[PDB]
């Protein structure tokens, strides 16, 4: 779970450290940490009525956006 050598940007307390590789001086040094990255069958997609919370979301089918809205 280290930083790759090509990585520019900001890592804390890099300026006061020395003598170690970029994957070791970063790996030695927040709870929500995501940078490193560690019913649908009861309705057909031609439907044109209304379901709540169903006019918002992508990354999945219409027949799947009524899955995530219900579930």
């Amino acid at each position: 779970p280290h930083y790759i050598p090509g990585y520019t940007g900001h890592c804390p307390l890099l300026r006061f450290s020395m003598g170690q590789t970029y994957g070791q001086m970063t790996g030695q040094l927040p709870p929500a940490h995501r940078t490193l990255l560690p019913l649908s069958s009861s309705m057909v997609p031609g439907y044109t009525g209304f379901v709540p919370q169903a006019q918002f979301i992508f990354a999945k089918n219409c027949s799947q956006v009524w899955a995530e809205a219900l579930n």
Partner: protein, 436 residues
């Protein structure tokens, strides 16, 4: 996709409309906060006809509320189902009208108009496909159509391009107790015809008679009078909202009830009205609904249907039902009294069957009729302009403002010809030779 925006004007639009929105919220299953607590899914399938989804599971209506007095729609926003309306829709003036119609058209010409047009615009455009608008108001007050033909002449510029219903409260025939009253009856008309042409004229005197003789409520307020109209408003839109065996939206009613383009007269009526002590002893059958909705008693407009001819009849019913009983209503009453169903129209009845009934009731209907006995409604207003128009005595209050009095005198000329056009199609028969 098909959708309605409710415009409420006056106290009358605001008090009737507030009762209307609580009815629809019960029918669709919305609490006074704005969330859904219904016991079915079809109560939610077409709720994009009157309500918009706001983030948080909070359904919000699509009514813009218009009045020229701040005080009236604070009671609307603090009523039982009153916090559902979004505040921006609540568009108020600071000074309204009073006493003189001539004041009413020489008072606030264009101040509140453009503010409402912005609200009507955003609410209509942020949607899919507009079925139309509906407007609740009464023909009265210290302005009549004085604010009206002032404010709405800026809105009628493009509004008659789609559907626009109007449940209008017509003046009652009782007494003249507004002192200088018979000047607001003449200056009311102008464009009283050619901008809605789907007006459901609703009298308050007939509203009491259904509450006194039919419902047998001892003390009917204005509130339960607004309950009767709210059922009818729900009735003419229930095929659009709830599924049915024979669907009929607003246009399908409008196409199938309006032979000529100058017929803003649809006297309403709700079939299964029974007293509380007599509801237990009620059959509630298809003939039972039909003998009440066609009856002169159950007519929310002070015009007895046996004074003229039904030009066209609509029969939007609700439940699991029949329609052939209505056929016997012509064949008995028409072919025997041909003056109660217009003969140059072969079949005068449109029917509709919406499966989901009103709450509590098993079966219902919603009659609207274009009977030619509505000649008398714009005739009581006709003897109520001529009676005091010629003296112009207390009109010195009018005189200070006092617009062009050709506009005084051209309004009834655009009303008595409407009566004549109804007198024609009451007396016109199939073989056009025997009435000359």
């Amino acid at each position: 996709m098909r959708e309605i925006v409710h415009l409420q004007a006056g106290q009358c639009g605001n008090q009737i409309g507030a009762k209307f929105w609580e009815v629809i919220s019960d029918e669709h299953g919305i609490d006074p906060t704005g969330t859904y607590h219904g016991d079915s899914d079809l109560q939610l399938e077409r709720i994009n006809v009157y309500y918009n989804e706001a983030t948080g599971g909070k359904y919000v209506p699509r009514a813009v509320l218009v009045d020229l007095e701040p005080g009236t729609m604070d009671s609307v926003r603090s009523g039982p189902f009153g916090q559902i309306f979004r505040p921006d829709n609540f568009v108020f003036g600071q000074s309204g009208a009073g006493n003189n119609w001539a004041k009413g058209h020489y008072t606030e010409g264009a101040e509140l108009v453009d503010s409402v047009l912005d609200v009507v615009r955003k609410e209509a455009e942020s949607c899919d496909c507009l079925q139309g608008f509906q407007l609740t108001h009464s023909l009265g007050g210290g302005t009549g159509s004085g604010m009206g033909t002032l404010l709405i002449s800026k809105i009628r510029e493009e509004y008659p391009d789609r559907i626009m219903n109007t449940f209008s409260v017509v003046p009652s025939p009782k007494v003249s107790d507004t002192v200088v009253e018979p000047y607001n009856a003449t200056l009311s008309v102008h464009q009283l015809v050619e901008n809605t042409d789907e007006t459901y004229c609703i009298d308050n005197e007939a509203l009491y008679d259904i509450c006194f003789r039919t419902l047998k409520l001892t003390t009917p307020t204005y509130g339960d009078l607004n309950h009767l109209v709210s059922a009818t408003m729900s009735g003419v839109t229930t095929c659009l909202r709830f599924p049915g065996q024979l669907n009929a939206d607003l246009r399908k009613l409008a196409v199938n009830m309006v032979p000529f383009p100058r017929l803003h007269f649809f006297m309403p009526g709700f079939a299964p009205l029974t007293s509380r002590g007599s509801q237990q002893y009620r059959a509630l059958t298809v003939p039972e609904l039909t003998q009440q909705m066609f009856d002169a008693k159950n007519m929310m407009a002070a015009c007895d249907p046996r004074h003229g001819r039904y030009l066209t009849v609509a029969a939007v019913f609700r439940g699991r039902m029949s329609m052939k009983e209505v056929d016997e209503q012509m064949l008995n009453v028409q072919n025997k009294n041909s003056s109660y169903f217009v003969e140059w129209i072969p079949n005068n009845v449109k029917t509709a069957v919406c499966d989901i009934p009103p709450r509590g009731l098993k079966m219902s209907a919603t009659f609207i009729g274009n009977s030619t006995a509505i000649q008398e409604l714009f005739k009581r207003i006709s003897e109520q302009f001529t009676a005091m128009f010629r003296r112009k005595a207390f009109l010195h209050w009018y005189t200070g403002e006092g617009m062009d009095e050709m506009e005084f005198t051209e309004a009834e000329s655009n009303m008595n010809d409407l009566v004549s056009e109804y007198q024609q199609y009451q007396d016109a028969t199939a073989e056009e030779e025997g009435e000359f």
